[PDB]
Amino acid sequence: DIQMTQSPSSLSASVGDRVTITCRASQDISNYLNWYQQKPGKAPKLLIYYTSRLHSGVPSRFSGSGSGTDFTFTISSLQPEDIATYFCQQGNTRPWTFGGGTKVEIKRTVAAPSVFIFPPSDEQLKSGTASVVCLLNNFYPREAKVQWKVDNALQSGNSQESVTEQDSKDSTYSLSSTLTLSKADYEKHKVYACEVTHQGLSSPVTKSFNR
Amino acid sequence: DIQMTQSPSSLSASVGDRVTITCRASENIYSNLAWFQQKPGKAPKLLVYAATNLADGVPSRFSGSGSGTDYTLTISSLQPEDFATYYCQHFWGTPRTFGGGTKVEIKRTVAAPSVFIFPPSDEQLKSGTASVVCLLNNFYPREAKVQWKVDNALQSGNSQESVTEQDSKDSTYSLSSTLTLSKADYEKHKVYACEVTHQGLSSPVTKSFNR
Amino acid sequence: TLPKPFIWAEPHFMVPKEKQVTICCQGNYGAVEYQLHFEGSLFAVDRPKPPERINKVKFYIPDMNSRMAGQYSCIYRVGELWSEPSNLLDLVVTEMYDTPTLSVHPGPEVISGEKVTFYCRLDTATSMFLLLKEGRSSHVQRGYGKVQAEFPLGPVTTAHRGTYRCFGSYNNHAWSFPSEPV
Amino acid sequence: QVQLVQSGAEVKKPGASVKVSCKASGYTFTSFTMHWVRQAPGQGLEWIGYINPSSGYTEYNQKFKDRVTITADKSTSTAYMELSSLRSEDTAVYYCVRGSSRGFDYWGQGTLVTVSSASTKGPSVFPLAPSSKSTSGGTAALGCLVKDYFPEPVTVSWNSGALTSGVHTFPAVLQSSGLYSLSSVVTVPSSSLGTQTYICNVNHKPSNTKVDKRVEP
Amino acid sequence: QVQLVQSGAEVKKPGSSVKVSCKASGYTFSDYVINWVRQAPGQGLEWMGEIYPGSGTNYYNEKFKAKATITADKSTSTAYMELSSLRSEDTAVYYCARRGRYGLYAMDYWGQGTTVTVSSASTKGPSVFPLAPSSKSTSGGTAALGCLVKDYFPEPVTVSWNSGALTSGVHTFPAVLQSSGLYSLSSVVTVPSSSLGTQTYICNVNHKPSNTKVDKRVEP
Incomplete structure (x- = not known):
């Protein structure tokens, strides 16, 4: 069972950049190597077959080189859509083995998030639970800090974050922060705010509302 | 599935008469048509093959014609031997289909039938069944309507007709109408009559008897 | 008739x-x-x-x-x-499915009269393999062998020249992709 | 001297199988096609299928295909037709017919396949005695009622075939009982009514019956 | 043209067996090898086995030879994978991929995946609550709105807007398992503030494992 070692795990490059992924096999696999592009959510798509051959539909910019155990995948000029997780695979001996996969992201002009707050819906409040949503929309880099302040007290442990994979169009990230409380816990306090800290923000943004 | 429509269903002609049978195919058959003469009892005999070609033995007076969909078999002067049922057949496409058939009969003068009635035999009555026979003898044309009335009550279904093939001797038909009743049904009523309607009859004839 | x-x-x-x-x-x-x-x-x-x-x-x-x-x-x-x-x-x-490997014994081009035996491998196929001489006199030569089939030609001649190809089979009428030429 | 000779008249119950033979002679069996065509009582012809003895290749009419199997024995120079799961409507005369370049060159005598729930039986012969209402002019009719037999055919003669002019044996008519019946009538001068004796001689081969009923007024 | 349609995602109580299917169309099923690839969270792509449909010839990975049962049905042109004795550890996204286009062992066409979840937890459909726009939700000339898809089991969930008519500006976030043992999610869509008292916005949420389909009008 041949072991495929992909390198690097991830990489970030500007648009129009030459990107090079490395792939190493334990045994000489000749040229029986394939490359796949996997976009977030979707199934892998065949990019390169037999080390260097371009699959029908795959653009000119994509390419592959090698022989034996050392192999490389290149993008001539990185496009915002090319943001995906790439994998190499061998077809020399059974079982077919895949590389751990190397992610690819795009470096672009720092953009501050647009912060939006959503109070608990009256339908949810009916149930007996209140979830407040803090959305940080279309920002870069991914590194963002969101704190929840119920009646100016820091609400540590009552919330869960979730960040989107980089947008294939404007190369940004979006993040949601949901504060989950009981109807009783929610009706107990007045002001509900989420305080956002990001590179693109000179001062932290405090999006709030009153119950 | 090619449908052969042969016209007319029957025809009556005197000896030495020109006869023309029509045959129309649903699709263009590219002369793949045959004609058969079938005499009473016997198997069909090939007359004309490939639309126009006569079969070895077939006399000069028989002629095949046509080019696709429309075909006619003609007899220049009808002889005594030529009185039979004629059929056209296609062999262009599967399944082979035959025309409905044409009964070529002898034309004669209209002769009214001699009507005769036969009551159930004592031997048959001895076997619990009873059949009254209405014989219409030596008539032309074949078309005749015989009704059965028991004690002035018209009957239906309880009787079956049977007509003879045209006599070679005097070119006539004879017809039997058998009214089948049980001994019990027969012994229940007294007057049994068969009413005959034919072209050669100015008024309908009512042949009857009493039990 | x-x-x-x-x-x-x-x-x-x-x-x-x-x-x-x-x-x-x-x-x-x-x-x-x-x-x-x-x-x-x-x-x-x-x-x-x-x-x-x-x-x-x-x-x-x-x-x-x-x-x-x-x-x-x-x-x-x-x-x-x-x-x-x-x-x-x-x-x-x-x-059909796979590409077989086509090796030659002793070499890719040799002196006349030398005993040449073409070899063709492909596991995940049948015991039947085919040897083909591209172009001029495109005849097929059938070979038997589990996983690797032997196609002996014996003492080579000038007719024995040409670019050869191998097919593996999944049945007598469903052959694999052609092997790299020799 | 091409001849096609088929197997004899078979009587079948509904749902049964019937296999009809056809012996080819006077010509080269393989060199031609063998088709099977049938004809229903009081109906036109209907094509069943064909076999090419040389190839063994057959084609059927979709109407059958499933029920039929036409087969050829090269060595015995005979063709066959097997019709399984027989419905009433399968009662017909089955002809084997030769397929030459000139179409259907030659046909066999035909084979009567009678399909019903009924069983072979003799007829009961009754005299249709001549009455003053069976006599017109100087002539009188008389006859026999051949009743409740199975299957067809029935042979009627008069006075051992002496009497021929005036004879009218009608076709068989199939009664609701699933049995056949026909009458054989004769017109003879009413003067001879008691001067000459009249015997209708009825023969039924299937049941093996020979009845000679005397028709007397 | 060429398609590989996989069966719906399932919840599987430990011990149970699963039969995931892969219906082939747009090509002659039997002339292409069907591979079954697994993708456990983080574990990456692992090849389980393959079938030569034409002759039903099977090739498994010893690792998965134990519970996986690859079978091909020419008569329906569908390839099946049976997973017996399901252990929690087996929870993953299951793919089917064809392998005959280039006789060089590459998976040219892939199915959509089947998210199998091994759990003693019962299936629960999501509750869909609206994230209604306001001034504490509108950035001058650009409004933000959406819907929270709370307490469902298992993954996946499908959020579309106006039944797929609204595709630009949408962000359906990755599911976050909660302390309750159930998943939650939020699909957010930015919209022009002018289109609020005119354009009706509906979020069409569908949870196939529980056959739930909820449509929520996000009123402001």
Whole structure:
């Protein structure tokens, strides 16, 4: 069972950049190597077959080189859509083995998030639970800090974050922060705010509302 | 599935008469048509093959014609031997289909039938069944309507007709109408009559008897 | 009497998967029906609309698969008579699953009179393999062997020249992709 | 001197199988096609299918295909037809017919296949005695009622075939009982009514019956 | 043209077996090898086995030879994978991929995946609550709105807007398993503030494992 070692795990490059992924096999696999592009959510798509051959539909910019155990995948000029997780695979001996996969992201002009707050819906409040949503929309880099302040007290442990994979169009990230409380816990306090800290923000943004 | 429509269903002609049978195919058959003469009892005999070609033995007076969909078999002067049922057949496409058939009969003068009635035999009555026979003898044309009335009550279904093939001797038909009743049904009523309607009859004839 | 038809494959009898193939049958003029028989069963029928005007028929497969790989014979009708079957057409579907490896013993080009034995490997295939000489006299040589088949040629001659190819098989009519040339 | 000679008249129950033979002679069996065509009582012809003895190749009418199997014995130079799961409507005369370049060149005598729930039986012969209402002019009719037999055919003669002019044996008519019946009538001068004796001689081969009923007024 | 349609995602109580299917169309099923590839969260792509449909010839990975049962059905042109004795550890996204286009062992066409979840937890459909726009939700000339898809089991969930008519500006976030043992999610869509009292916005949420389909009008 041949072991495929992909390198690097991830990489970030500007648009129009030459990107090079490395792939190493334990045994000489000749040229029986394939490359796949996997976009977030979707199934892998065949990019390169037999080390260097371009699959029908795959653009000119994509390419592959090698022989034996050392192999490389290149993008001539990185496009915002090319943001995906790439994998190499061998077809020399059974079982077919895949590389751990190397992610690819795009470096672009720092953009501050647009912060939006959503109070608990009256339908949810009916149930007996209140979830407040803090959305940080279309920002870069991914590194963002969101704190929840119920009646100016820091609400540590009552919330869960979730960040989107980089947008294939404007190369940004979006993040949601949901504060989950009981109807009783929610009706107990007045002001509900989420305080956002990001590179693109000179001062932290405090999006709030009153119950 | 090619449908052969042969016209007319029957025809009556005197000896030495020109006869023309029509045959129309649903699709263009590219002369793949045959004609058969079938005499009473016997198997069909090939007359004309490939639309126009006569079969070895077939006399000069028989002629095949046509080019696709429309075909006619003609007899220049009808002889005594030529009185039979004629059929056209296609062999262009599967399944082979035959025309409905044409009964070529002898034309004669209209002769009214001699009507005769036969009551159930004592031997048959001895076997619990009873059949009254209405014989219409030596008539032309074949078309005749015989009704059965028991004690002035018209009957239906309880009787079956049977007509003879045209006599070679005097070119006539004879017809039997058998009214089948049980001994019990027969012994229940007294007057049994068969009413005959034919072209050669100015008024309908009512042949009857009493039990 | 009733001439025997001729059957042939256009472009060739070796048809790679999902490629177009046209089987041609030349019977006689004024023949009403033309039948294509596949592996002992009626496959297709052509009824030449003007029959006296035609002596040949075209049957075409749009996407070639394993399901239509095998033996073909041609028969035609005149009246109710049938011509005796045409020659057999062996329609082979190539480029099925895998590519076999084609090694040569002792070398790729040698001095005349040397004993040459071509070797062809492909596991996950049948015991039957095929050796083909591209172009000028395109004949097929059949070989047997579990996983690796031996194609001996013996003392080489000048005719033994050419670029050779190997096919593995998944059945007599469904061959693998062609192996890299020699 | 091409001849096609079929197997004899078979009587079948509904749902049964019937296999009809056809011996080819006077010509080269393989060189031609063997077709099977049938004809229903009081109906036109209907094609069943054909076999090419040389190839073994057959084609059927979709109406059958499933029920029928036409077969050829090269060595015995005989063709066959097997019709399984017989419905009433399968009762017919089955002809084997030769397929030459000139179409259907020659046909066999035909084979009567009678399909019903009924069983072979003799007829009961009754005299249709001549009455003053069976006499017109100087002539009188008389006859026999051949009743409740199975299957066809029935042979009627008069006075051992002496009497021929005036004879009218009608076709068989199939009664609701699933049995056949026909009458054989004769017109003879009413003067001879008691001067000459009249005997209808009825023969039924299937049941093996020979009845000679005397028709007397 | 060429398609590989996989069966719906399932919840599987430990011990149970699963039969995931892969229906082939647009090609002659039997002329292409069907591979079954697994993708456990983080574990990456692992090849389980393959079938040569034409002759039913099977090739498994010893690792998965134990519970996986690859079978091909020419008659329906569908390839099946049976997973017996399901252990929690087996929870993953299951793919089917064809392998005959280039005889060089590459998976040219892939199915959509089947998210199999091995759990003693019962299936629960999501509750869909609206994230209604306001001034504490509108950035001058650009409004933000959406819907929270709370308490469902297992993954996946499908959020579309105006039944797929609204595709630009949408962000359906990755599911976050909660302390309750159930998943939650939020699909957010930015919209022009002018289109609020005119354009009706509906979020069409569908949870196939529980056959739930909820449509929520996000009123402001």
